[PDB]
Amino acid sequence: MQIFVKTLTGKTITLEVEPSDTIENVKAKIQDKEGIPPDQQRLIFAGKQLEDGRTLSDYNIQKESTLHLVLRLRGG
Amino acid sequence: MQIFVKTLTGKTITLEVEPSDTIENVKAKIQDKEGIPPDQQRLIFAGKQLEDGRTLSDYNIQKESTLHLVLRLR
Amino acid sequence: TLTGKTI
Amino acid sequence: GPVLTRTVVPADNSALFTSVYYVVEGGVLNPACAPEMRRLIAQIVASDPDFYSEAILGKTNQEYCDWIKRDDTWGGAIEISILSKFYQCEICVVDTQTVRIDRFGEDAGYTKRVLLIYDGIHYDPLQRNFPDPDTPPLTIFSSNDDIVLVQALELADEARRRRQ
Amino acid sequence: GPVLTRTVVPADNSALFTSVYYVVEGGVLNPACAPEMRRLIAQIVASDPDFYSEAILGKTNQEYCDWIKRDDTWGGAIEISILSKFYQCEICVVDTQTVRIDRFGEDAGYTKRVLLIYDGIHYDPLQRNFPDPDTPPLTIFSSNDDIVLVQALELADEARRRRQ
Ligand SMILES: [Mg+2]
């Protein structure tokens, strides 16, 4: 099915997934599509940061759901 | 022939090509492998921006290359 | 200090 | 050809703010800007607790505001997205860890673009230097100017190599 | 006597963990300890669900374990009580905001004691230095050492004094 990822940078990533997909594989699909390394990804859905071990159905993520992406870019 | 492309997203890419393939048809082959609209994209070689009508012959690129794709999002 | 940052 | 160049700002924990300031102001290094820029962040975070939720911030809205106001906390993506809008320009972070560019203000149609270089720990501003004695460096580029992004990507490659 | 010495750890949201690590390991500065210490804490919280319940957690057991393992969330009293048992020592926190010492593990008869300083947001580890620089600072004290409590609380009295 399809889900979306709204980024802080601005764009919205469209993805192709199955509810059986791990959050891990969700981040892996983002690396393939946008080059962003998994470790640098925070996905927030429904007021929770998504944990890698779980699946999209565990977080009750359905088709046309919009996830939120924030990059770990702290420096100083 | 066969070439390289680099995205700003940190990805090195390869592509199937011939010296008569226009840039627009090179700007469409990106829609085939990555799905990025033509009007959103810009290609660059040797510090030059590559208009659509022009061809990879007169842009003097053939083999063992590198390239850069840059997005005009909207 | 090592790494390090000081104001 | 003019050359993309890093200027090294103090690594005092505020280098994100100092670097942003340097580029949006056209090349002004002023470390004292940081406390004010942080207060501006806190003002904007507190103004939208619906968006800046506990989930996004990893703590309460109020806690985040107090945290970011400190002189020892590091700015990141939240701060850059905010500064992009405030200054109404694209803020392109060139990440030399894996050599990629994160473009804040990507889809807001700003006319202006600025660049920071980031190694995972430090931020410094980038600028274009000219070989002509009379032409001062430029830190603000047109959103049309995609070649500067290419030069930045290469500078990222080189910077990665040199660091190792 | 003379006040204790503060060693500054990064304000990177894991300062509690880094500070506890620093003192219990005798003076070792390692911010990379944090993901493991958080994991350790999640184990314990999940290792005894009946005890570590939503009543003291502020959210469900599983919610807490997930929360405390984020790299951006703050540890507090729950984490200090747990780490106090784990490292088998009194953990005494000088609060410069409230001007007092909170002692964790006081009634358990631990033989040793460590000190942290806290300003309401940021933890740093405290130590007692020696003039002989070849002698490493001391970070673990007898649980009967009153003087170390004094040298620590002075830092808090001095902070309040400065606000006046
Ligand atoms: Mg008592």
Residue numbers in the entry:
A (entry chain C): 1 to 76
B (entry chain E): 1 to 74
C (entry chain F): 7 to 13
D (entry chain A), E (entry chain B): 146 to 309
Article, verbatim:
Sixteen ovarian tumor (OTU) family deubiquitinases (DUBs) exist in humans, and most members regulate cell-signaling cascades. Biochemical analysis and five crystal structures of OTU DUBs with or without Ub substrates reveal four mechanisms of linkage specificity. Mechanistic and structural studies of three closely related, unstudied OTUs with distinct cleavage profiles revealed four mechanisms for achieving linkage specificity, namely (1) the use of additional Ub-binding domains (UBDs), (2) specific recognition of a ubiquitinated sequence, (3) the use of a conserved S1’ Ub-binding site on the OTU domain itself, and (4) the use of an S2 site enabling DUBs to bind longer chains in a linkage-specific manner. We selected three members of the OTUD family for additional investigation: the unstudied Lys63-specific OTUD1, the cdc48/p97 interactor OTUD2 that cleaves atypical linkages (Lys11, Lys27, Lys29, and Lys33), and OTUD3, another unstudied DUB with activity against Lys6- and Lys11-linked diUb.
In contrast, and to our surprise, OTUD2 displayed a marked specificity for the peptide that was derived from the Lys11 sequence of Ub (K11 peptide). Furthermore, we determined the structure of OTUD2 bound to the ubiquitinated K11 peptide, representing the first structure of an OTU with an isopeptide bond spanning the active site. Clear electron density for the isopeptide bond and for four residues upstream and two residues downstream of the ubiquitinated Lys revealed how the scissile bond reaches across the active site. Unfortunately, the close packing of a symmetry-related molecule most likely affects the position of the peptide, and residues that affect K11 peptide hydrolysis (Phe4, Val5, and Leu15) are disordered in the structure. The peptide does not form significant contacts with the protein, which would have been expected from the peptide assay, suggesting that crystal lattice formation affects peptide binding. The Ub in the OTUD2 K11 peptide structure is located at a similar position in the S1 site of the enzyme in comparison to structures of OTUDs with Ub-based suicide inhibitors (Huang et al., 2012; Messick et al., 2008). The K11 peptide structure revealed how the isopeptide bond is bound by OTU domains and how the proximal Ub is contacted to form an S1’ substrate-binding site on OTUD DUBs. The Lys side chain approaches the catalytic center across the loop preceding the catalytic Cys, termed the Cys loop. Interestingly, in the structure of OTUD2 C160A bound to the ubiquitinated K11 peptide, a second Ub in the asymmetric unit occupied the S2 site in an identical manner. Nonetheless, this revealed another mechanism of OTU DUB linkage specificity whereby OTUD2 selected the sequence context of a ubiquitinated substrate, in this case recognizing the Ub sequence surrounding Lys11.
